[PDB]
Amino acid sequence: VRYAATEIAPTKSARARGSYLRVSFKNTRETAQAINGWKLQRALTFLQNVIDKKEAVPMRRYAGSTGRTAQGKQWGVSRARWPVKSAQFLIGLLKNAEANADAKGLDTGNLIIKHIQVNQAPKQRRRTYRAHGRINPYMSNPCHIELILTEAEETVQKSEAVVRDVESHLSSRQRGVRIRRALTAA
RNA sequence: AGAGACCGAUAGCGCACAAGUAGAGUGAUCGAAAGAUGAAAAGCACUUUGAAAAGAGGGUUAAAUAGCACGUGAAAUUGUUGAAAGGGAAGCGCUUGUGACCAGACUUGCGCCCGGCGGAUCAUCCGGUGUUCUCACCGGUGCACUCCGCCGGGCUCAGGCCA
RNA sequence: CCGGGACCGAGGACCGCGCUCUGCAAGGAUGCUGGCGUAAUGGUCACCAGCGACCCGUCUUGAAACACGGACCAAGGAGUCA
RNA sequence: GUCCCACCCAUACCCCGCCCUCAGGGUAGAAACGAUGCCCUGAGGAGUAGGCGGCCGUGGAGGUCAGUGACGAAGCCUAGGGCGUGAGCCCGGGUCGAACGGCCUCUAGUGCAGAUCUUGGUGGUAGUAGCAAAUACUUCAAUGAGAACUUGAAGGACCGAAGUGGGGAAAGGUUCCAUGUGAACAGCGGUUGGACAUGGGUUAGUCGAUCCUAAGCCAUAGGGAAGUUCCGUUUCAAAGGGGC
RNA sequence: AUUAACGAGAUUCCCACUGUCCCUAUCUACUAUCUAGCGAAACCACAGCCAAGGGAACGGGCUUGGCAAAAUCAGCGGGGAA
RNA sequence: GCCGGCCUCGAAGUGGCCGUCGGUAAUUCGCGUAUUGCAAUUUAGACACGCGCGGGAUCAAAUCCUUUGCAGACGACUUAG
Ligand SMILES: [K+]
Ligand SMILES: [K+]
Ligand SMILES: [K+]
Ligand SMILES: [K+]
Ligand SMILES: [K+]
Ligand SMILES: [K+]
Ligand SMILES: [K+]
Ligand SMILES: [K+]
Ligand SMILES: [K+]
Ligand SMILES: [K+]
Ligand SMILES: [K+]
Ligand SMILES: [K+]
Ligand SMILES: [K+]
Ligand SMILES: [K+]
Ligand SMILES: [K+]
Ligand SMILES: [K+]
Ligand SMILES: [K+]
Ligand SMILES: [K+]
Ligand SMILES: [K+]
Ligand SMILES: [K+]
Ligand SMILES: [K+]
Ligand SMILES: [K+]
Ligand SMILES: [K+]
Ligand SMILES: [K+]
Ligand SMILES: [K+]
Ligand SMILES: [Mg+2]
Ligand SMILES: [Mg+2]
Ligand SMILES: [Mg+2]
Ligand SMILES: [Mg+2]
Ligand SMILES: [Mg+2]
Ligand SMILES: [Mg+2]
Ligand SMILES: [Mg+2]
Ligand SMILES: [Mg+2]
Ligand SMILES: [Mg+2]
Ligand SMILES: [Mg+2]
Ligand SMILES: [Mg+2]
Ligand SMILES: [Mg+2]
Ligand SMILES: [Mg+2]
Ligand SMILES: [Mg+2]
Ligand SMILES: [Mg+2]
Ligand SMILES: [Mg+2]
Ligand SMILES: [Mg+2]
Ligand SMILES: [Mg+2]
Ligand SMILES: [Mg+2]
Ligand SMILES: [Mg+2]
Ligand SMILES: [Mg+2]
Ligand SMILES: [Mg+2]
Ligand SMILES: [Mg+2]
Ligand SMILES: [Mg+2]
Ligand SMILES: [Mg+2]
Ligand SMILES: [Mg+2]
Ligand SMILES: [Mg+2]
Ligand SMILES: [Mg+2]
Ligand SMILES: [Mg+2]
Ligand SMILES: [Mg+2]
Ligand SMILES: [Mg+2]
Ligand SMILES: [Mg+2]
Ligand SMILES: [Mg+2]
Ligand SMILES: [Mg+2]
Ligand SMILES: [Mg+2]
Ligand SMILES: [Mg+2]
Ligand SMILES: [Mg+2]
Ligand SMILES: [Mg+2]
Ligand SMILES: [Mg+2]
Ligand SMILES: [Mg+2]
Ligand SMILES: [Mg+2]
Ligand SMILES: [Mg+2]
Ligand SMILES: [Mg+2]
Ligand SMILES: [Mg+2]
Ligand SMILES: [Mg+2]
Ligand SMILES: [Mg+2]
Ligand SMILES: [Mg+2]
Ligand SMILES: [Mg+2]
Ligand SMILES: [Mg+2]
Ligand SMILES: [Mg+2]
Ligand SMILES: [Mg+2]
Ligand SMILES: [Mg+2]
Ligand SMILES: [Mg+2]
């Protein structure tokens, strides 16, 4: 179908997606944002350390009236949590993409999370019961997830010069000064 | 049974659909929401990862930016990427600056002279036909200092923006 | 009667009132010269800077009001017919 | 306190340009004119409630452009352009798939920010308030992708015969039993379920109903009431049953 | 007008008793609090630091001053004429 | 004026002496200047920052984690590894 990047050619990359997944959208957004631009192996290790509560996911946007911990000093922040259920879903998709890379014939030794994105899905409906005979809604917030992996090169050492454009519409008095200084210096 | 300067799915009857239906009330009674894949299902064979739901390849089609959560697909609200600002709100009016991006205008035209090239037939007169009854058209004559077109060289004039 | 500066050039054949009368400053700007011919002049947007700037609708002598309605968006919504 | 110079700036005053409104003139033996046009001259411009004029848009109808269109109509997006004082009009780029427009007349269910307005959809609050009555769970093994709330065994506990036990009446209607299972439901999980799918299950001369009458309700004889119907139950009635 | 017995009926004093008080201290269980899973509602013109002034005679916004530095957690009951 | 050697300077650390080297109309001359076309900033200073060479010098810590209870709602704090 149509991924959101559209500038990555589906020949030198691998991708995976999943839709209508019944997990918290707010928790998954904070988890996906922590692993973005990382290597495939570093990310897989990190997600398991979260499940075992040895490393923490920093909460930046959706962090209203939450708790504090010492495992957040790694990220320079003070509020962090351990979204176990979110990490499980992400690991499943990262494994599927890595499997897709092997079938194509890529080199899984150095792959990079190039694109990762979480969107809101249609909600599901339940009800509560309140005092004085009133009924209120009780809803869940699922999500869509997709990602793309590409190889890393980080190899550019080409810098341009004034060759692209030269002084082209100078005045007659400007041209006179340039020539005189050229003659004097040589 | 035939029609209309009527309405076009929040409209028109409450009902374009298994509608006086599903549902509520002890009962008399109350009473909805809900139309559109494609010309044709040709409704995705096979391989691979996964416990499975599914994903990635590969197929059908004019089109999958039409996959049954299906014509087109707006706003509120949200994700990623890119650009920028932030010492107890922000937004707005007048006027410069910086950065990014951009519409026009201009590229020549008429005339005169000199040379070359090509074609005619320029003025006049005779016949025919129109018409505003004196002005034209067609046929014939004309045949090189006339008429028309192109190219080469020189000259005058007019031409864009800011001073 | 002589100097020094600033802003402006509407009109588009002739005709008029006149004068210092081969002509003119008299019913509204012409003459000469240089640079450049493109993002240079010009335009749109974003942001910083100087000055300015109370929330709309409504009743009321008097509304920014410690007076009432208004969380946001789409579609419907009120002087007609005999 | 009194007197004197110079200087600063209002949308006021003076001069110039342009817009509109009002007033006054010119223009045919027509080489003549959107005569509803064009040329010349002067003055003026605040505004709620309210009055009048001119114009711009929307859905349909008659006429006309011998109008545009699958070589792409309509609709939608666009810190890309041009015109208009303004409501608005026109063009470029993208998406898309079957109809649509200009001009003069005709016609109306014809122009929205408000009405604690109607229907539908969506935010901040916010991963927040909370998920704390009824004393309580622990070890090993097995099943399974996955086990605190599934099964076995072993410990520890509660109900304590006016029971958290064994059976019924009203009410419900398959909730009963076996096998299996993706989603949804069991406000945590779930391999378990009163959930979901496929099959099976209720046997009477003796237990009930059926028979009798109670409080009561309604037919028949009759009397009211325009009538739907009201009274009346043994009465002011020629009202039955037994044998060969 | 009196009146034995009776009263979850109204009132005054006495004995015993005590954290009602001088004057407050300590302990236990469940919360709150942190984590995994699940997950609402009221309300909302726009917002949210002050002193004085004038003003519809008690300003978050106006005028003149004081000042003024990211993003945040547990409590609190002055104001928001909540 | 750049360097080097001696002294000196504490309010937010400065000045002086000496030496080598380089430049230098107080007087008077000889060659060069044009064409930037009759104006168009006189692109010229000082500090910061970046980049590229060539030489020297150097081989460190903090957080998570486990632990303590002189501390504590959670972070944080006093300790040990
Ligand atoms: K908290
Ligand atoms: K209806
Ligand atoms: K019913
Ligand atoms: K086609
Ligand atoms: K295709
Ligand atoms: K389509
Ligand atoms: K004028
Ligand atoms: K009112
Ligand atoms: K109000
Ligand atoms: K119309
Ligand atoms: K287009
Ligand atoms: K949650
Ligand atoms: K309990
Ligand atoms: K119990
Ligand atoms: K029987
Ligand atoms: K028998
Ligand atoms: K029976
Ligand atoms: K019977
Ligand atoms: K009886
Ligand atoms: K009767
Ligand atoms: K009593
Ligand atoms: K609390
Ligand atoms: K939690
Ligand atoms: K006051
Ligand atoms: K003001
Ligand atoms: Mg708080
Ligand atoms: Mg709390
Ligand atoms: Mg409740
Ligand atoms: Mg109730
Ligand atoms: Mg919600
Ligand atoms: Mg009909
Ligand atoms: Mg509908
Ligand atoms: Mg309808
Ligand atoms: Mg549809
Ligand atoms: Mg497929
Ligand atoms: Mg298409
Ligand atoms: Mg949808
Ligand atoms: Mg669609
Ligand atoms: Mg949007
Ligand atoms: Mg701003
Ligand atoms: Mg002839
Ligand atoms: Mg002029
Ligand atoms: Mg020139
Ligand atoms: Mg510019
Ligand atoms: Mg002001
Ligand atoms: Mg007040
Ligand atoms: Mg009122
Ligand atoms: Mg209100
Ligand atoms: Mg409609
Ligand atoms: Mg007026
Ligand atoms: Mg209509
Ligand atoms: Mg089109
Ligand atoms: Mg836009
Ligand atoms: Mg079609
Ligand atoms: Mg209407
Ligand atoms: Mg509206
Ligand atoms: Mg209004
Ligand atoms: Mg909580
Ligand atoms: Mg509970
Ligand atoms: Mg509670
Ligand atoms: Mg239990
Ligand atoms: Mg007991
Ligand atoms: Mg006991
Ligand atoms: Mg059972
Ligand atoms: Mg079972
Ligand atoms: Mg549950
Ligand atoms: Mg579950
Ligand atoms: Mg289950
Ligand atoms: Mg069932
Ligand atoms: Mg019996
Ligand atoms: Mg009767
Ligand atoms: Mg009778
Ligand atoms: Mg105050
Ligand atoms: Mg006062
Ligand atoms: Mg206020
Ligand atoms: Mg101020
Ligand atoms: Mg409180
Ligand atoms: Mg208060």
User: Which nucleotide's C1' sits nearest to the alpha carbon of A174?
Assistant: F36
Give the C-alpha separation, A95 to A8, whole Å: 20
* Listed resolution, Å: 2.4
Burial class of residue A148 in the structure, from the number of CB atoms within 10 Å of its CB (0-12 exposed, 13-18 middle, 19+ buried): buried
In Å, what is the separation between the CA of A1 and the C1' of B38?
19
- The one-letter code for the residue type at A86 is S
Per the CB < 8 A criterion, the answer to whether A94 and A44 are in contact is yes
Give the C-alpha separation, A86 to A79, whole Å: 17
Which residues numbered 128-167 in chain A sit less than 7 A from strand E, measured from CB?
Answer: 128, 136-141
Which pair of tokens denotes residue A36?
A: 């973005």
Residues 6+ apart with CB under 8 A from A119: A143, A144
Helix (H) or strand (E) holding A90: helix A84-104
Which of the 8 DSSP states describes residue A162? G
| Shortest-distance ligand to the CA of residue A26 | 12
Between strands A143-151 and A111-120, the pairing is: antiparallel
Per the CB < 8 A criterion, the answer to whether A43 and A113 are in contact is yes
Kindly report the backbone phi and psi dihedral angles of residue A18, in degrees, each rounded to the nearest multiple of 5, phi listed first: -155, 145
Specify the experimental method. Answer: cryo-EM
Kindly report the backbone phi and psi dihedral angles of residue A183, in degrees, each rounded to the nearest multiple of 5, phi listed first: -65, -45
Per the CB < 8 A criterion, the answer to whether A91 and A32 are in contact is no
Q: Where are the alpha helices (DSSP H) in A8-71?
A: 25-34, 40-51
Report, in ranges, which bases of strand B sit under 7 Å from a protein C-beta: 48-50, 52-57, 64-65, 69, 78-81
Distance A1 CA to ligand 5 centre (A): 10
